[PDB]
Every structure is written in structure tokens, then in C-alpha cells.
């Protein structure tokens, strides 16, 4: 248990031999390794290296692997220094996690020589020119599908005299090929369910098939199915990294949307009642019930102010002024949390 | 609301009955029509200028041509002949004025030789010291008779009261006739009879004061 | 089904104010109004006046001053009143339930100069809120639903009497083969009309009732005839049940055949 | 007057023994307690610990207090050091105080067996199953009461045949049993009239009884009694940590709401006068008085803009443009203070 | 020179004696003063104090006259050390001009038996009881001076029969009275004219007197004097430490209001021209000239949206969408500078 | 392998001599310069300046050139320190590059004393009095050109009778003259056309000349030309240092405007479809097609709310409430990036 006087550029740093002996793969825990640096003239190893970063490494030996970065040393020089002392790769990952970066993950691969060949072609698009081509085709089949949905409703517009059935069929044919190839060439049929984008593909392909069946074999129930056709805009989220951050932002902030709608509802039951009672006995617009004023308090608090219903007394007008300012405050109170979450996810890309 | 005197129509014929009013009444598009058999209440024939009230056939049609509202019965059937009124509001909705009517008449009922019934006064009616002579006319079409009384071969004219023709249950007509006579003049002559002529044919029923039962 | 039964004083005096009351069973819980409809014999239809469930009565513009109809939601019943009755006002009165819905409380909220062709056409806040009247986003009705049977109200100063009923049976000459006539005589009664039944409503084969005539003394006259098989002459009990509503009279005179006792 | 030399891992700290004897309960203060870590050969008290954190421990002896954290030493590592030097619990408390973290609050319990059972049933909802049941069945009773208060004033809608009176009566009982059972089980009935939420409960109960009294023994006083019915939504404030943080944010930020309404009023008296004078002699809408324009300047500055009254000249329109921009500025000037207060209270939960 | 070796708790500082000589007065300059600390057993001084804050002291001597604070030492402890070494109150000033904390403006209370005792009654209100009385009655007179400028121009309303003239004059009496007490008791006449709050009083007292002069001896003069009367509500800026901060914000941010109005004008000449050309040949509302659309582009960009004039084609509508988003951006770009200036002035009060 | 012992004010640094020789120009590298301070008695080279700043210098030689700045030492003291040491111009500019002030460039100059004379006259208006005159005549000519553009279209308003052609001909004369005298006196005719502000001048000079030429030669191509005349208001961007920051800001953040318009479009296709289906079978305003509702969802989400089309059922109204709140969120999510870019470019001027 003799004291060892390591010297880093003039700054002496004595520690007990056992404290370093506990870690034997490091530079100072491997005597055949550290011997080179040890100068025996004064019995003190001399390393001419950065001075204010040896304190961290000592704590790692002293506290059984607790590695923390001094906040007056940049990451590059601290990352380089753990390497010279050869604390070891397992140590580096602990440091990497402390910064909080996303340098952990790795994809699997089919590795069968053909399953690997189709999967590379479809899942990853920058890898080869045929692959860049497939994806560009897939943005068009979604854009020529959404154009068909809105046009059908225009007032002017299996007999196949309907071109909004031939064009839908080609679109519900390509989308189905992508779903099937992706399934057969997938490395795992367990993680196929995990991706939400595969579920988006299932939901945007179903209502064409149950419509087909009803004709091939709910009169206003059909309409519930007709709207569920609108979830083909969320097939854009594969070929866009600007939308996947919106996915991760709204999943990590569910509590601060519950708060936004809760705060907004309490006001709509608290300002509406005031204006109904204030404009009670006059030809007061439509304030004929507390339940009626709920439209007026949502339009004034969110600042849209359509102007359909407005107060017409003096008490109504003073309650309208307080309603407008209480809605700029109860809106702007939970939104800084959600804007901050987007900023962390957006820049962490780098 | 002005309507003419009479309209005569047959079985299977189309008669456009006019309601000539004004745009406070027919310009409402909520007029009313009615149907009145004598001896009954009026029954709602039409409402709304085209709408049909319950119990009314779709054949009746409220075609309108301006302020002269029409009624079109395609194929006039038997039970329709009655007094037909116009009705609406006037410059308000809780308000009303009717018309005074027109008679609609249907020809085509079963004609037959009349089943006439005569009743002589009762014995308690002779005890009550009066003599009414019942001469009834039934099962006859067209509804036209003249009411005569017959002493043994000579006419009796005075004291007559008769009713106009009225309808019966089984699609025919019915009538009656009363000769008001003193009991001293009933028990003075030996035989009394009721001559009734329907389309020229006279069916006789005879009674005497001296015949028991 | 709204069942309407009229009850009141039917035989009144000159210069005495009228009163009927229609018993209304079957009140539908809708917007429908009750009134009365009068009709003299040989004279056309005429409205008298209404009342609604709110309290505003409406009458004929020829006749506003001579009606008073009252409401009661506790008995569910409607009434009638006429003043200054004379010989032209001899009428029968049908109580009636009428469907009466109306159509104008619009105002240009903003000054008229602002309301324009472009705005009304393209802006809905202008069209259905700010400028309803200048743009045009603001007519009557009258049709009955439920008629009534009628009650006769006639003005007179004379007195009312009951009927005198007599057995009227066929003779040995008046017989018409296998089917013979049979009936009753209602004579010297006032007023019109009186019904004569048979077997308390069990004999309807050949039922024939006749309208009554007027006399110079002040009484009315009718009789009846039913066609019965002549073998049953003396077998069944034939009872023509005269019921007189202004006098409360029921004379159950049983009709027996003829004999010479 | 002797000079003790401490040696934290090679770094020599020297100090006056008097400064070290100020407190004997501390590891270094008691001669016996610190004697174990002494080295005779070097005449020093060697410790193999963290080099950057002992500067702060020696200030505490030198200043006789004032514990402060070096700002490069992470909170966990510094705390670990105070315990090893046995600074003592009083010092520990002062350290938490300078950062300001609060764990001090403590709530006594009746502990009389019957009282302890009832108070841990109606006060801490997670302590069992029955307390979860009571929490859910109270949230239910509040929610059906609010629907009865709005549908009671729709326009289609003690004889006890009215459904609205019967359903309100049952709720006014549950609300009072919970106030009474809490009052009896409260450990200290001094505190009970001081808590805000206890008061929010009594206010919901008062309107129902005063009516029953009026009806068993106020023309618009009763309309005010109908308004003060509206505070039964605030009974939710116990069953949410979203409303309590809004309560503290609007309590510790009263000055920056006084400023918001004061700034807004000065503008409404300064822009309204300009538009009345500019649109003075023309068929100028309703600008018939300076007092009339106050509605126009509150709707344009808060950005609702209903469109009921607008300027119609050239001077009116230039004053309307300056009014709109001066209201985005005088609104957004005190709101960053209030949004910051919510963020501190919201995250300090952790 | 001779190498003074200064120990500060175990951290040996060494320098040249001529560097200490630069300031003869300081604790290290006078050798009779620093004589107490010297210990000749080790030849070195031992000033036992905070080790990490002596560095800046020695840097002040070496550069001759620069002081800065070490960033991991708090302001209490750095200040305490400056006093112990007596760097002097002029040096303590240098620290102050670096921290920036509000320095003390000289309090020139005047000097005479009553002349000072009156400028204390009016200028400083927290001094006593009657000065509190003058503050409260002056705020009451300002608020019945605004009520009478609004209620006077209501359309329902030296006669002496005129309640409005008499109430207006008692206010002008009191304003003039209070201003003359304070122009006589002022310590300096030249400074009085410079201060803004003396100019506010003068221009609020002018128009009642020059109307009396013209009335007792104007086509648009009379038109505009009634508008310059609205500046009696800036007299309230004396009794309110939340308007003086708004005055300092708007003065320290004139450049970022020039930018706001300049950015807003460029858009109004760039979006208006587009909509006039797009809705050129149709019954297009009032877009009959590029000069007409300027009202539409100010109302859509500031988000008021009255709804008086809206686009009615397809090109007009696409230009209306881009106008709305370009106005949320060109408004929100210079406002963070002005909100930050208010925050510095607001909190620097402490 | 010789250890030298530099001692900066007491804090001893020890290094091998090969490290010192790595850079010859440095004070330590050259033997002649270093020998001046060496003190033979202690064998150490004493210097006497800031101690906390020598670590970055010694880590410079160690790393072979990578120079940093420690986080506690301010910029002035660190810059002055590199100078005393004598490192090199590339080292100083390497510090300036690691710091992030971009002072590297200059401007070529004609060096002919006529080309030089008028290029100094025009391009650098802080030269002389006449250059300030030419800048002010240039600003006034741009302004009267914009005023001429907008007035032309007012309903009331080459035969020389028309004033507007004459005033517009003089402004095009002065624009063309300024552009040609700048182009010939420009020291490169090759870096000219790559610029932007000269391209703006060409674009605002072209359509008058093609109007002139074809006037002397389906919907008027003249009409599209008559739109590209509006870019004469971008020539203020030479005489205004608040438009050039908006140019660099809107360039450096194109990705966060693509995101803003993409997020806004996805909502307009997702909320519009909901309201069309909800208000499907009623006299529902103009919601006669999904393509029609696109105007309603852009006006409600950006908060303008004109009030021309509004929902009129219960499902329409609940979709209108969610539309309003989802547009305050999808607008405020990418705007903090663009406001931050303006702040960096705006303050980096200093
Ligand atoms: K807004
Ligand atoms: K708005
Ligand atoms: K609006």
C-alpha cells in the first residue's frame, strides 16, 4: 500500500497503490504497461499531458468507475484523454452516455444474399441509384392519391367509367406491393408490428378493401370508413425527417397537452356563465343558455374572433375584455415546454 | 267565399270545381275545403291547397291556377255528393273565414221500383183523438215523387207535410209524407190510401177504419 | 284521436248571452288550437273564435265583439259564448281543433351603408348576423284537424215538450210477402231530432229513419220503418228507445203486432 | 498556533489549529476522531479523496459557516463529501438552503386508531384501495354536478318531482359528508379554516342552503347567488396537480398582472380618444363618444377583432394600424415573467 | 527585485516586490501594515483566507489597474476579501462598474430651515405622514381629470352653470398650485426644466389657459388643442414605478421600433400590389387601386382580421395565405430585443 | 529528454525540451529570447503574469497547434497573453476562428485615382460630404418611384401630357446612370454579376425598357411584366443595415420555412376534411366540398378569423376548437429557430 506520486506536467498527484490496483487493465494498473512513463530518478512517473483533466481520471479509480467530465474541459480533449490512459472501451461508453448522445444503436440485417438484397433496396434509400428511384416513385403515389381524395368531393365531378376508381386502384396496388415486400424481406417478423409506420400502411390500405367487399358480396356508417381514408397523409413520414421529430415531440409531451386542453376547458365553463348572466334579460344575441356561449368563449380566448356572436351590454363587454386577456395567458403557459422538447429532438440529430 | 249554385256530374267523370278567391286566402297555400251532407257535420275535404286530409281519396286534386283554385275529382264515385265549402285564413294565421258552399251532385245510383210503406193510426192514437197518416217512400231513384192521398177513388189534398228526399243505408234514397186529418174525418170515410208516383209508376197500399189487424 | 262532446244550454232566450262547452278528450301535446264552427241549416260555414294554450284568443274579423272562448288545462275542456242572439243566429255549432302556425324580428345590427352586394353575397357574418334585414334571411297558415258533431242552439221564447210514441205494426193487407215493414211513430215532440233504435242496436236489417217536418203549432214529426221477416211478427221484443236530451226523457214503448182484442 | 497540514491527494492545505478547533464534533475538529488518518513520517493528515471539493470545506471552518458549493463540483459528489467529513446535520440543512431545495414540509396524523384510519382514508388517496375508490367517486360527483348546472339553464328545461332539484340535492349531501368527516378527523382544527381548499368546499355548500331557507321562510341578489354557484368547479383543485401549480403561479405573480391591466388601460384611453377625434364629423360608425370607442380598442389591441366597429376615414385607419401593433407589444411585455414563474413551480416538483 | 512569497492557506504565490510597490497605500504596500502577518520560521507570510479568490487581487496589482471577478467565487466572498486587503473604495467602485449594479445617484436634498422641509413634503412622499397625504390626493385629482375628459365628450352632455367647467378648474387650480410649490423649493432651476416629469405638468396645464386667453381677448388650432389635452394621463407616471420602466424601455430601444415599422411597411407595399393585380378584373370587393389594399394588408398581417375586405378569387386567396404567415414572422423578429430590454430595467431595481 | 521548469508566479510547470523546440518563433523555442528571464540560482525561468492562463499555452505546444481558451479567463487578457508569448499570426487568427469572430477579409481597390476616385465616390458613402449627397439623392429617387407606382392605379388618375410617364422616365434615367457608372468603375467585371444587389438593380431596370421597345415595335404578358415592376423596393437594401440582416437570416434558415409551410399544409388537409364530413347534410355555409374548406382552416389556424365561413353544428364546432389550438402549436414550433438566427446575425455586428 505504498504511495505512488504520479506527476502530470508539474502538478503532483499522490494516491495509494491499492486504489489504482483495483482496475488492472488501465495504463497505471498494468505495471508492464505504465513502466515506460515511470522515471525512477525521483520515483515519480512523469506524463507531459493536459493538467486539468487528470483529476477526473483519478476519481474513476477512487470511486469505482464514476466518470464525470470537468466543466472547464471540452469533450474532444476529454474523450482523447481517456484514450491515452486506456481506461478502456467499457469506460468510454459510460462517458458517452453521460453527455446523453445517441451513439449506441445498430440495425440488424437479413444476411441471406437475396433477403438482404431486397431489404437494402427498399428500407434504405440513399444506398444505390435503383433505391433512390424506388423512394422517389413512392412520394408520387402518395401525392397522386391525396389529389384524388379532395377532387372526388368537388361539386362538378366496377363499371370503370369512373376514373376516380381506376386511379385509386393503381394507388392501392403499389402501396400493397411495398407492404408485402417489406414483410418478406424483414430481418424480424417480431419488430414488424413495433414500427408505427407499418401500422400506418395497414390503416391506409384497409378501407378500400372493405368497400370493395360490400359492393362485391351501414348506410351512414360507411361515412365513418370514408373519413378513415384520410390517414394516407401520414405515409409521408417515412420519406421525411422533419415529421419524425414531430412524432417524438408529441409523444414525449402528452402531459403538457392534457394541461392545455384542461386549462382551456375550465375557462370556457367560467367565462361563458358570467356573460350569460350579465346579458340575461335583453335581446342579447344568442346568449339564450350557458351551453350556447361555449362557442363565443373558445373563439375569443384563442383570439380567432369570427364576430358571429359578441356581447351587447356593459357587463357583457367587461367580461369580454377579461376573457380575451385570460386566454393569451392560459394558452401561453404550457407551450414553452412543448417548443423546448422539439428543439432538443431537432438539434440532437447532429 | 263565392261559389256557384249547383254542379251536376256522373259516375266516372272529371269535374274541376272552382274556388275563386284572392291571394290573402289562396295565396296562403294553406286553404281549407269541406264536404257537407245534410244531417251530418261538415268533414274536412282539403287542407293546404293540395294536401289531402285523412279519409279523403288521392283522386281529389287541388290543382291551382292563381286566385281561382280548382278541385279535380278524376272519376267521380258515388258517395261524394254534398255541399262543398271554401276556407282559409285572412292576413294572419290564427284567423279564419269560410265560404257559403256549392252543392256537388252525383248521378248513377241504382234505380228501382219504390218500396213504399203506409202506417194507419194506432188504436191508442184514436184514443188520443188525433189522426196522422204515415205514408213513407223508400228504395227509390231518382229522388223525385209528388205526394198524393187517395180516398176511395177521390183525391185528398189539404193538411199535407212531406220531407225532401234523403239517403238510406244501402246506397238508395228515402222519403215520407204526412196527411194531417181530424179523427172525425178519419172515422167518416170507409177507405184511405197513399198514391205515390215514382217515374210514373204508382204502387198502392190500402187501409180502412173497420179492418181489425 | 280527439273526442269532442258538446255540453251547455241549448234552448235560450232573445237578448240572452250564449254558452256551450266542448268536452275535449285526447289532448295531443302539440301546437294546435281549439275553436268552434257554426252552421245554420241551409247557410254556409262561419268561424266564431278561438283560444290558444298561451292566452291569446283570435276571432273572426266580422265577429270580434260577439265571442268569448275560455281555456282550462285542469279539465281539458273548451267553451263558447255568443251575445245578442236573434232569429238569424239560429245555428248548430261544431267545436273544432285547428292547426295554426305563423311567420320578422330582424334588424340591421350595423349601419345600412356598410351592408353591400359584395358582403352579403360572400361574408356569412354579414349575411346571417350583421345584415339579416337588408339582405333577406328572416307567411300564414289555417287548416283544422279535428271536427265536432255539433249541438243545436236556437233562440225562442216558447216552451219545450216531449214526444208521444205509438205501436205501428203491419196488417193483413199491408204485408209484402215474406218480408214486412215494422216501425215506430214519434209525433207531437219538440225540438229536432229524435233517434229510434231497435233491440237496443241489434236489429239493423232494413233500418230506415226519416228527417222531421215543421208544424204551425210548434211541434215536429217523424216515424220509423224496419224490414223484418214476417214470421217473426210477435216473437221478439222490439223496443225503440227514444232519448230526449233537452228534456231527460226515455219512453221504452215495446212494439207488439196487430190484433183485434 | 500549530500548523496542521492536510494533504487531499497531493494538494497541501495548511490551516490555523484554532480555526480547526472551532467545532469538535466535526471529523477534523475532535483530536481523537480525526487521529486515525494521520501519517507520522510526513507529519500530515493524508486523505485519498476528491481534490476539487476540499476548498469549500476549509472555507466553512474559516468562515464558521456559509457552506457554498464550488460550481464545478456536481451536487451529488459534493453531498457525498460533507458526510465523510462528518460536517454534521445542521451544516447539511444550510447547504440545501443555499440551493433552496425544499423537503422540510411534514404533515402530522391523528394516530388515535379510529381518527388515524379515517384521516388516512380521506386524505392520502394512494394509501389503500378504499381511498382510490373515494377519489374516483368524488371526481364523479363533481362532474355530474357541473353538467347539471349548464343543462339546468338550457331553454327546453321542494316538490321533489323536478329531476334537476333531486339530482342536485344528492350531490349537496355527498359534498357535506366529506366536509364533516374531514372536520372531525382533522388533527388540528386550528388549521382547518386557513386552508384554501377547505374554504372552496364550504362556498359550494352555502348557495343551496340559503335558497332552501328563502323558500322555507333578493331579486337580483338571487342571480348573484346563481353566479356564486360557479365555484364548484374549483373543487377539482384537490384532485389535480395542474391546478395547484396555477394557483401558486397566480399567487406569486400578482404584481405582473397589475401591470398588464394597467398598461392595457392606459392605451385604451390613449388610442380611443385619437380615433374619436379623427372620425369626428362623418357617418363614422358608432364613434359618437370617446367612451364608446373603448370596446373597439380592447378588441383591436388583444387581436380578437370581431369586426363590429371599424374605422372609415384615413386618420382613423392610420390610428387603427398603430393600435394593433402597440397592443402586441404592451401584451407581450409582462407575460415572460409569469410564464417563467410557472416553469419554476412546475419543474420544482422533481 | 526581492521575491515576496505569499502563502494563502497552502497555495504559494510569488512575485516581485516592485510590483507590490505600485500601490504604497494598500495592505501589501505599507510594510508596517503587512508586518503583522510575516512569519520568519518559513520566511513567508500566511494570510489564512479563501484560496481561489486571491488570484484576481494579484492580477490587479500586476496590470496596475484592472479588476475582474473569478467566476467560481460569489459576490459576497469576493467583496469581503477586497475590504480585508483594503484595495480602497475607488477600487471597490471598479468592481461595481464591472458587476453593473445600479450606482447611487447623488441625493441633493436642499439646505435651509423650511425650504428643505418643503421639498421633502412634495418630492419625497414616503418621508412622513403629510407627504403620504399629498401623494394620495394628487392621484385622486388625476383620476377625476380623466373622467371629465371622457364624460364631457359623451353626446348627452364660464357659465358656472356648467358643472364641467367648475370641476375642470378645481383640477387646473390644483395642478398649477402643486407645480409652483415644487418650482420654488427645487434645489436647482436649470435641472427642473430638463426633467421630463416637469414638462408633462406644463403641457397638461397649457391648453386650459390659452383657451381662456383666446376666449377673453383658430380654425385647426381649436381642432388640435382638444387633442393635446389627452396628456394628463402621463401625469400618473410619477406615482408608478411600472411606467417609468416602460419609459426607459422605449427610450433604450428606439432602433428596434424603427425596424418594426420599416419591416411592416415594406410588406404592405409588397403584398397589397399582388392582391390588386390578382383580383384585377372581377367585382373584386374594393381592390380598385393598390393604395386601397393598404388597409387589408395591415389588418391581415397584424392578425386583427376585421373581415371588411377579403380576397374573392384563387390568386387573391393564395396571396392572402402568404400575407398572414409573413406577418407573424415580420412582427416577431424585433420584439425579443424590446422584451429583453424591459426585463433588464425591471429586475435591476433590486 | 531534459525537464525545464517554467514558474509563472509560483505555479510550477515542468516539460521536456523537445516540446519547446516544436515551434521556433515562440519565446521558449528560441534560446536567445528565453535566456533573458532565466534565473540561474533556482534553475527555473520565472515570469510574473496571470497564472490561470498558462495552461492553454502549454497545451498549445503539446497538441502541436490546437489552441483553446479556458472558460474562466476573459478574452482581452487571453489575447494580450498570446502576444507576450509571441506565437504567430496564424495562431492568433486560429484563436479568432476558434472564437467565432470572422475578421479575415478586405475589399480590392482600383488604385488608379480615377477608377479609385469615383468608386470611392459611390460605394463607400462615409468617405466625404458629396458621397453623403449621392446617397441621399439615391434614397429620394427610390422613394418617389414607389409613390408613382401606387398612385398610378388610383381610380381618378408618351405625349408628355401624362405627368406619370415623365417622372417615371427620370427615375429610370437616374437608375441606369448609377448602374453604368458603378459597373465601369468596378475593379472586377467578373465578381460583379455574381453579386445580388447589382442583380436587383438590373431586374428593376428591365421592364420599362421592354415596354418602350415593344411600344415602338391571351392575358397580357404585359400584366406579368407589370408585376415584376414591384421589385424596385428592394433597392433600399443598400442604404439600410436592417434589410441586409433579414437577407442573411432568411437565407441561413430555409429549412425552417419549408417546415412551417409543410406543417401548415398537413393540418389544412386534416382539419378541413373533418368539418366537411361533420357539417355534411345541413344548410352548412359553404362547406360543399373538402376543397372549399381550405380557406376556413388557413384563417382559423393562423388566428386571423375573418368570420366569412364558420361551422354551424356540434361536430363542426368541436372540430373548430381543436383547429384553433392546433394552429397556435404548429405555428410556434419552427419560429424560435428563425428568431434565434436573426439575433446572432443582428448582434454579431459588434
Ligand atoms: K390573433
Ligand atoms: K382575429
Ligand atoms: K376577426
Author numbering:
A (entry chain D), D (entry chain A), E (entry chain B), F (entry chain C): 103 to 259, 289 to 348, 359 to 491
B (entry chain L): 4 to 216
C (entry chain H): 1 to 103, 108 to 142, 147 to 269
Authors' account:
The Kv1.3 channel is a voltage-activated potassium (Kv) channel that is abundantly expressed on T cells where it plays an essential role in cell activation. When Kv1 channels experience sustained activation they undergo C-type inactivation, a process that diminishes ion permeation and is thought to involve a conformational change in the selectivity filter that disrupts ion coordination. Here, we report structures of human Kv1.3 alone, with a nanobody inhibitor, and with an antibody-toxin fusion blocker.
We then solve the structure of Kv1.3 with MNT-002 (Minotaur Therapeutics), an engineered antibody where the peptide toxin ShK was fused into the complementary determining region 3 (CDR3) of an IgG antibody. In contrast, the monovalent Fab-ShK can bind only one Kv1.3 channel, thereby forming a protein complex amenable to single particle cryo-EM structure determination. We then solved the structure of Kv1.3 with Fab-ShK to a global resolution of 3.39 Å. The Fab portion of Fab-ShK makes no contact with the extracellular loops of Kv1.3, or any other part of the channel. In this way Lys22 functions as a surrogate K+ ion as proposed.
